[PDB]
Amino acid sequence: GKGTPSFGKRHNKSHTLCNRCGRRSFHVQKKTCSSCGYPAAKTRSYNWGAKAKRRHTTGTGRMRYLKHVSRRFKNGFQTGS
Amino acid sequence: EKAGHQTSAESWGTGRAVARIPRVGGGGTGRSGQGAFGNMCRGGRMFAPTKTWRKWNVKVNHNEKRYATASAIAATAVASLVLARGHRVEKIPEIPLVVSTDLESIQKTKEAVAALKAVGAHSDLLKVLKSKKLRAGKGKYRNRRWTQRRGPLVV
Amino acid sequence: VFQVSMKANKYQIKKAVKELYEVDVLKVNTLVRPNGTKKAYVRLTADYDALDIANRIGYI
Amino acid sequence: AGVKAYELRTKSKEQLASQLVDLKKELAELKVQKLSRPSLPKIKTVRKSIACVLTVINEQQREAVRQLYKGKKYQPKDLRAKKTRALRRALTKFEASQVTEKQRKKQIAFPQRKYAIKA
Amino acid sequence: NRKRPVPKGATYGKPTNQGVNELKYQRSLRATAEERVGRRAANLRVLNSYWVNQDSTYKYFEVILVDPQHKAIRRDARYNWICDPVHKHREARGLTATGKKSRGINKGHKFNNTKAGRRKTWKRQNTLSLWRYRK
Amino acid sequence: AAQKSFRIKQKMAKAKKQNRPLPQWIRLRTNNTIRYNAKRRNWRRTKMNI
RNA sequence: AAACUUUCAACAACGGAUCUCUUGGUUCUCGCAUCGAUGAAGAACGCAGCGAAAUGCGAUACGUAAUGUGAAUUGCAGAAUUCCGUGAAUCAUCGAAUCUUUGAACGCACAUUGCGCCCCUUGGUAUUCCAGGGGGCAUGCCUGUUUGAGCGUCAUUU
RNA sequence: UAUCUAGCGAAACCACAGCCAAGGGAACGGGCUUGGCAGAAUCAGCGGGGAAAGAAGACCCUGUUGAGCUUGACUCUAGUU
RNA sequence: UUGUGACGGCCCGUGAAAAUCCACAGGAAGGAAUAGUUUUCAUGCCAGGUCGUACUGAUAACCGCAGCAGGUCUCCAAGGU
RNA sequence: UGGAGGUCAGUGACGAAGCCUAGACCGUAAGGUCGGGUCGAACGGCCUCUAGUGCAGAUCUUGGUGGUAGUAGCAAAUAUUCAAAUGAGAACUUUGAAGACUGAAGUGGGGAAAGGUUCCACGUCAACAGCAGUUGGACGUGGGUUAGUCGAUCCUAAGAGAUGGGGAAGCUCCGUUUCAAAGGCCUGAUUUUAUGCAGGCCACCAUCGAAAGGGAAUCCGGUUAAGAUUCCGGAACCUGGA
RNA sequence: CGAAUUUGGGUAUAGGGGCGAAAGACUAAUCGAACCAUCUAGUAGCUGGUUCCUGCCGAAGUUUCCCUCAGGAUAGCAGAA
RNA sequence: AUUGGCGAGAGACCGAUAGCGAACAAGUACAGUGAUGGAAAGAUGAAAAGAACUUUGAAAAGAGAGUGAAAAAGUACGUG
RNA sequence: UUGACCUCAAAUCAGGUAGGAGUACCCGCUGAACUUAAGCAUAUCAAUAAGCGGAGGAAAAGAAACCAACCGGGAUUGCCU
């Protein structure tokens, strides 16, 4: 009864959505996210998880502020008009 | 160096009616269960991947280089060798061809062409001009789109 | 019946309807719709006519 | 086309507030009309006009606060410059160019001489 | 000593690596003292430290720190070198006096292993240098 | 579930909004090769499992 | 002797090889140094006249200012003399702003769009209650300010 | 149910294939040799054969290949004294 | 069938906590007269935000690769024998 | 065979490459050359250079396709039938009639977890419902979830977990009142200055943790295509304020 | 089949670890040591495969040593220069 | 020194089963509770000129016709 | 009694500052095993991978408690050797 009848019994999420990353990796009872390590300050990352670093890194999102830094540096961090 | 190896494929072993090549794990992807990590495998690493520490430049003795240069200079003065090399020098009075230093002092392309016409190198010029043809392969999109002959060398 | 800012509560909706349409309201009900936007049923007092206010707003 | 920021800049506080209010009213009415009309591209122009009025008001307010804080140190953080965290933690020109009196005496006594080797 | 932090002493390897007890930390008690002090007072920069007292259980040290944001240090070029970012966490990178001593940074034949940096030296003398015209 | 949280309901709303086919005019847009929505979802086929 | 098995060809199928192409990759070389509590990287939810999406942006939401160019955008529609012009544009540049909920994430909490407190303003006959608008309240540490504590301790009394 | 019809419609398996007797042969042939023989296309059954299919024998041996367990094996070790 | 009550049996098993609300002891403090106290008596005035709420809950809405004879907690419960 | 240096001022939109052709020639052969068809943009001979350079197998890899084969099979859960309507088309849709079943620890009426719009209406049948389909939980377009009283929210349970402090190189571990100087709560001060203070009381250990535990309070009738202890009509109750 | 009962939800225990009324049982179809990524293209005296043509020459399964006996070194046999 | 970032220039490199996993709405679709795993997918034509109209069908569609250099290019599109 | 001083506190006191990302290169700590030794334990792999802390455009090192033994050289770094 370890196969289909036991799969009939699984309806209790052990992971819900995480605040820091929306990945469904937040362990409810452990209170920690299995992907980003939330609520720890440091984002969870490993040097054996190169693909994971690819998935979660700079340039993967919008870069709402960092994208303009190169332009501002090229112009010398100017203030005026 | 990581081409073909960015997978966690493991061999299934024997007993599963498939070859023993490493296979991609997981499911619901279409790539799971597929062969990996082999030259025979689609998406795998090539056999003996090309390395940058292959020998590119090859050393030659200075004296042998100068021997070859002297032989080439001496061959430039053989009338038959230039024709065999295909340089349209039939109309030239005699070779080696020596022109005054006013040619060194020349300034414009029109008068350079005029000098070539005067001394008989123009035929070589039209050979180069009419030899222009598209390359015969994938060298076109490697910044080698056209081929043409070699004209006179003004020294 | 209004589409309402998702951050607006019943107090704010009542105040805004009163300020915008010069009408006294009797009750406000709200629900977050399955498409994710707030929907407010604002019942006016008997002194006002919702139909007249609607055709004043522009939709009959 | 909508309203123009240069002519908006000549208006005063009450004028800009009044323009904002009736622009908001017109946007509301256009939303009502859009509810029934197939396409209504004027709503984009009116929204842009509200953005123009708002940015002019904000520029006036920020310039007034800049005038208020002019001359004194401790500017508000959103009013002072935004170069880079490191570029702000870095020593200023004066602080970097500071040198001790011993090194200053040595530098004035023996500055790198300008010389050429010909004769 | 620094007891190996493995459970029940099982190291899971060769008998050469099976040791747990008499293993010695490669940094000094001074180094860990100023590391902890700098981590607590993360807004200062660890200038130096010295020994003051010791009993059986503890060694006691005193750590000198400098504020890089104080205007008495930022001006006055006598000590504002510490205010440049390259001296962030000298105690953590091993740039203090105890750090240099533990790294082995010293001139001579006795420090051939660790003079310009142990790992840098190892990289330099384990790299394969190939030229265009092979030598 | 009937007793939802607002986070779950917001995800439900976003999924319902995203589940719609291609507007007809993007097809006519120039230099366009998109023909349909390839991220379409059915509640029986694929679970978003939030 | 057709039916049937097989072989071959023509035409038609199935399939997507080959050939040619290439806004992609890979490797080498050259130059430069610039993330974040002035809130980063990342996440979530939204914003287009008609959009669901590796686009862009943030309730000023496919963007607003300023500057340059100089007449477009375009799939359809469209404000509609904006065209000898402080002026089109899914343009470029970009120095002013806006920048939802979050996030090192900072009032407390967080599988809750949960619960406070402080200060001004406006309403409900209100310092207290309720509601709305704005502004705040994390921790370690440094320098200073103020208020203190300790027979730790020094001068000034029976 | 099987069966026949309408619709719908897979899989295992497949070097090529598919009648035997004896011979010899890797000493138990569908093919080879020598004989018997040998007539399209097939349906339902059947379980003799295909040394039928299912799985790089799980027994045994070999490998200077492991692992679980045990001990007065060798070499250590947490703890403890 | 459900609820309640008064009882009886069992245990080397005797069968949660907290918020919260009320009450009692005590007597601080305060209180006269054309008016004091009582808002634990009656009547009268105002407000009550945020999020969920549809539907299935299974031989078709969940899990088992599926509209899978499997698995998955619970309430109501007519007549006759 | 791919690419490279020279050369044939080589072939080519008047048709390069590729492909197909029981057509021809040449070489022992690897192979080369040509006739015809198709096609539409590049390619070859020679002298050399170079290599990711030649496949029948590897239970090879990826993709595609067969024979088997119109074959196994689509047979559990008692069962369907007649007639109209709609429709191109009806064993399967709608309606009417009949026969039945579940038989109230139901094949009924609702909920918890889970799902996420599957709810409802209109239109529609290419795909999906292993037959069919006019039907559908499918496809297309829209509509729909209304609360002081139901929940969450508040409490604490097992437990989880900051602070103070102590370990640890450190990511972090312990610890939850501990060797801590750990706060909020009554009435006067109360507009020469406030919310200060010579007013007064005390001394909890943060916090999170239950949609079945504990808890402030709502019922009836009507109403929708789809919501209702939520809307409307009526009739109440609680909490907090004045 | 009234209890060492059955069961929901919450919570604790995590891999040489847990948990076990004990079967090496169970720990997400995985258990005499889970799963995931990496070291790692781990090593294999062992099995399998190893891609064009023609021409000329053309073997060995033996000697010695080897934890050597499915393998090497050495000498022999062979080609080429 | 520098397989990251930002600008450039290049190659006897690869040429859509190759080259990065990704030439495309690619770290996408979707698989797993989770850590993680992770594709396939380029080419009409110079220009849609993307087939008006007739006819037969309920329709899909066919047959004509038409556009185009070509429909032996008809979106299921280069060659095939 | 009034004032210091020392040490220790408190404040939504004034102003700052740290955290987190990315880590190719750089500075340290911690730290294997596969592997080779034709077995294997020292050794090897390797003072490497994984783990942790910390910077910059470079970092680090750096003006000798050096090298040397010479007729002596003369901070550090990198290349050839």
Curated annotation (Swiss-Prot), chain A:
Q: What is this protein called?
A: Large ribosomal subunit protein eL37A
Q: Please give the cofactor(s) recorded in the UniProt entry for this protein.
A: Zn(2+)
Q: Which UniProt keywords apply?
A: Cytoplasm, Metal-binding, Ribonucleoprotein, Ribosomal protein, RNA-binding, rRNA-binding, Zinc, Zinc-finger
Q: List, alphabetically, the SUPFAM superfamilies matched.
A: Zn-binding ribosomal proteins (SSF57829)
The entry assigns this protein to a family as follows:
Belongs to the eukaryotic ribosomal protein eL37 family.
| Function per UniProt | Component of the ribosome, a large ribonucleoprotein complex responsible for the synthesis of proteins in the cell. The small ribosomal subunit (SSU) binds messenger RNAs (mRNAs) and translates the encoded message by selecting cognate aminoacyl-transfer RNA (tRNA) molecules. The large subunit (LSU) contains the ribosomal catalytic site termed the peptidyl transferase center (PTC), which catalyzes the formation of peptide bonds, thereby polymerizing the amino acids delivered by tRNAs into a polypeptide chain.
Q: Please share what else the UniProt entry notes about this protein.
A: Present with 21800 molecules/cell in log phase SD medium.
Q: Name one GO cellular component term.
A: preribosome, large subunit precursor
Q: Which gene encodes it?
A: RPL37A
Cited Pfam families: Ribosomal_L37e
Q: Which GO terms describe its biological process?
A: cleavage in ITS2 between 5.8S rRNA and LSU-rRNA of tricistronic rRNA transcript (SSU-rRNA, 5.8S rRNA, LSU-rRNA); cytoplasmic translation
Q: Where are the zinc fingers (C4-type)?
A: 18-36
State the free-text cofactor note.
Binds 1 zinc ion per subunit.
Keyword rRNA-binding listed:
yes
Q: Provide any one GO MF term from the record.
A: zinc ion binding
UniProt-listed InterPro entries: Ribosomal_eL37, Ribosomal_eL37/eL43, Ribosomal_eL37_CS, Ribosomal_zn-bd
> Could you say which residues bind Zn(2+) here?
C18, C21, C33, C36
State its location(s): Cytoplasm
Please indicate which superkingdom the organism of origin belongs to: Eukaryota
The answer to whether the entry has keyword Zinc is yes
Curated annotation (Swiss-Prot), chain B:
As for subcellular location, the record says: Cytoplasm; Nucleus
Its domain of life?
Eukaryota
Q: Residues where Omega-N-methylarginine occurs?
A: R42
Processing after translation: N-terminally acetylated by acetyltransferase NatA.
Q: Which family does it belong to?
A: Belongs to the universal ribosomal protein uL4 family.
| Purpose | Component of the ribosome, a large ribonucleoprotein complex responsible for the synthesis of proteins in the cell. The small ribosomal subunit (SSU) binds messenger RNAs (mRNAs) and translates the encoded message by selecting cognate aminoacyl-transfer RNA (tRNA) molecules. The large subunit (LSU) contains the ribosomal catalytic site termed the peptidyl transferase center (PTC), which catalyzes the formation of peptide bonds, thereby polymerizing the amino acids delivered by tRNAs into a polypeptide chain.
Miscellaneous comment text of the record = There are 2 genes for uL4 in yeast.
Domains as described in the record: The eukaryote-specific C-terminal extension harbors a nuclear import signal and delivers the ACL4-uL4/RPL4 complex to the pre-ribosome, triggering uL4 release from ACL4 and incorporation into the 60S ribosomal subunit.
Q: What is this protein called?
A: Large ribosomal subunit protein uL4A
Look up and give the organism this protein is from.
Saccharomyces cerevisiae (strain ATCC 204508 / S288c) (Baker's yeast)
Which part of the entire sequence is included in the shown chain? 54 to 208 of 362
Swiss-Prot record, chain C:
In the record, what terms sit under GO molecular function?
A: RNA binding; rRNA binding; structural constituent of ribosome
Does the entry feature the keyword Cytoplasm, yes or no? yes
Q: Where in the cell is it found?
A: Cytoplasm
Biological process terms from the Gene Ontology for this record are: cytoplasmic translation; ribosomal large subunit assembly
A GO-annotated cellular component: preribosome, large subunit precursor
> What are the protein's UniProt keywords?
Cytoplasm, Isopeptide bond, Ribonucleoprotein, Ribosomal protein, RNA-binding, rRNA-binding, Ubl conjugation
Q: Which domain of life is it from?
A: Eukaryota
The primary site where this protein sits is cytoplasm
What family classification does the UniProt entry report for this protein? Belongs to the universal ribosomal protein uL23 family.
- Subunit annotation: Component of the large ribosomal subunit (LSU). Mature yeast ribosomes consist of a small (40S) and a large (60S) subunit. The 40S small subunit contains 1 molecule of ribosomal RNA (18S rRNA) and 33 different proteins (encoded by 57 genes). The large 60S subunit contains 3 rRNA molecules (25S, 5.8S and 5S rRNA) and 46 different proteins (encoded by 81 genes). uL23 is associated with the polypeptide exit tunnel.
Identification of the protein by name: Large ribosomal subunit protein uL23
The range of the complete sequence contained here reads 83 to 142 of 142
From Swiss-Prot, chain D:
Q: What is its main location?
A: cytoplasm
What Pfam families does the entry give?
Ribosomal_L29 (PF00831)
- InterPro entries cross-referenced by the UniProt entry: Ribosomal_uL29 (IPR001854), Ribosomal_uL29_CS (IPR018254), Ribosomal_uL29_euk (IPR045059), Ribosomal_uL29_sf (IPR036049)
**How the protein assembles, per its UniProt entry?**
Component of the large ribosomal subunit (LSU). Mature yeast ribosomes consist of a small (40S) and a large (60S) subunit. The 40S small subunit contains 1 molecule of ribosomal RNA (18S rRNA) and 33 different proteins (encoded by 57 genes). The large 60S subunit contains 3 rRNA molecules (25S, 5.8S and 5S rRNA) and 46 different proteins (encoded by 81 genes). uL29 is associated with the polypeptide exit tunnel.
Record-stated family: Belongs to the universal ribosomal protein uL29 family.
Note in the entry: There are 2 genes for uL29 in yeast.
NCBIfam families for this protein: L29
What protein am I looking at? Large ribosomal subunit protein uL29A
Origin organism is Saccharomyces cerevisiae (strain ATCC 204508 / S288c)
